[PDB]
Enzyme design. Sequence first.
Site, mmCIF file in Angstrom:
data_model
loop_
_atom_site.group_PDB
_atom_site.id
_atom_site.type_symbol
_atom_site.label_atom_id
_atom_site.label_comp_id
_atom_site.label_asym_id
_atom_site.label_seq_id
_atom_site.Cartn_x
_atom_site.Cartn_y
_atom_site.Cartn_z
ATOM 1 N N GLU A 1 20.622 65.769 55.074
ATOM 2 C CA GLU A 1 21.672 65.499 55.153
ATOM 3 C C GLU A 1 23.006 65.855 55.813
ATOM 4 O OE1 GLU A 1 22.465 60.716 52.559
ATOM 5 O OE2 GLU A 1 20.990 62.221 53.548
ATOM 6 N N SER B 1 40.187 19.789 7.004
ATOM 7 C CA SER B 1 41.436 20.252 5.922
ATOM 8 C C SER B 1 41.561 21.886 5.075
ATOM 9 C CB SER B 1 40.418 19.731 4.743
ATOM 10 O OG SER B 1 40.136 17.713 5.096
#
Length: 608
Positions: A47, A314
């Site tokens: 590279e 409740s």
Amino acid sequence: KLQDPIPAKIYDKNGELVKTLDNGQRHEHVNLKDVPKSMKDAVLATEDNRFYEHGALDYGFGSEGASTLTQQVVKDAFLSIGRKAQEAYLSYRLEQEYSKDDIFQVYLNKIYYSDGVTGIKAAAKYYFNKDLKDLNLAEEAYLAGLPQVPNNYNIYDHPKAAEDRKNTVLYLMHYHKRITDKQWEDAKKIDLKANLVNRTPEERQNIDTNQDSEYNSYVNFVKSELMNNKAFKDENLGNVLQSGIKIYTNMDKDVQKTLQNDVDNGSFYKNKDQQVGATILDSKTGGLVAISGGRDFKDVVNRNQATDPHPTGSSLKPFLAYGPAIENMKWATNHAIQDESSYQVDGSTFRNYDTKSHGTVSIYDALRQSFNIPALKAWQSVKQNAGNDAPKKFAAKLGLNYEGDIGPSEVLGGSASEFSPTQLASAFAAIANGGTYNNAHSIQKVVTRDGETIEYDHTSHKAMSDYTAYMLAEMLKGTFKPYGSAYGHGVSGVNMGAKTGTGTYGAETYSQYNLPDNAAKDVWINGFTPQYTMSVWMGFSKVKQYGENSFVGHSQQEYPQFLYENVMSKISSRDGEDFKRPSSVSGSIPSINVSGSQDNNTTNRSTH
């Protein structure tokens, strides 16, 4: 400018690693010193062979001023005007401010190798089942070559192409004098496919993202709470979770596995559409020990049903009716309220669940076996004696807020009485610890990439007086005694009390869907010992005709109670720790009064 993505680690109340936020992803971080020379040599040959030498002025636009290797690291971080000129300049910048090692390390950690693999270390484990130390030259040459164009060089799909790329890389290594004539010659004779992991195409795509799944709900909570701190509420959540942080929590590893295993494996589901949400807090401090978002909870796919609001039924009768009466007007548990078979409030008829009147009842009996009508009366009496905002105020200090006027409906847990298990757990924990409130909190501390320990904190103040907390504690133990609403789901060792809920449908809905008369929609148990508080909710993803997706009857409405009892049976301490008795109260159940405030309106009777 660059950063070296490491994923966020989560530790439990004991500092033991538990979950790393990696996803299933195929990526393993590697330090530069830990990659073998030959593999670095491969990548440079391929590279940029003069990577270390090169500086800007050795000459698209910008090409020759960063190195191709640096430029690859930047392209990636950008994969719309002039987005290549930008890459070229951003790369000059990186070289100005970082070393070539820093950049190389990043390159060996982020570039793609096809099939979901990022970085060289994962590459070698995936393709050849090898640590980097073990790769032969052919294997290295191929891995150096792969990422120029990785879907097109992948050996699985393109064997010939991989073979020829390997040969090129070997050629270049030889040309740039990084290997001898004798290695090159030996390297060509190696079969690249010899150690290629034998794999079918579904396995190539099958990443297991849902490991350690019992923590999925906990993790989701943490992401929400993480960002609420000063340090982070400017920032990209995705970004924060990829920058070395160590979060230390109040999770109890074992309690979390118990919870979720029972959520998944329990036998209290009617059908596939039944949903559940549970939160367990440390009663005394308010810390999140375990949370569960539902059956088989996955993070972003499902709604965390323990942090979402639901009708409460409740469940709030202690907070909007009986609690305030005790706090302000100083009623005994003995205190008498007249029950009716129908009662009118504002412009509406209300009835008890069972439609009957039960005579003059103690608030003990009326709380523990959960009556609608006397609860409305207790509320009404509060407004008449403590002010019309006296219920609001009391709820407020317990984290339960309302934007409009609290009406009769929200007292019985309809209309705007929609809250989350986590919210309700926090409210009930205040009963369980002598009356102080702690916002539910998972995080103790965070430790940044580089030591700077950022600190967390939680809304924490006095909610009620010490006598109110004791009295309610002892009243709500009754919910487990005969004729209590959770009779039969207690643990015989343990000093727990509990408030159940059952929420309902509107009139239109019963007829539109032909629901039976006893069909409920939301069902809770809220329970607490002095050590844990645990709030459970179950409902259904949607209504169905004839009652499919409802809790029809008493025993379908009990389902939440079975999860609660299974879990507390297993996690509760057995010492027999009791609630802390203060010197402001006198007497004992059913007849506790506030010292020096003899209640003058009491009854002796038990309902059954």
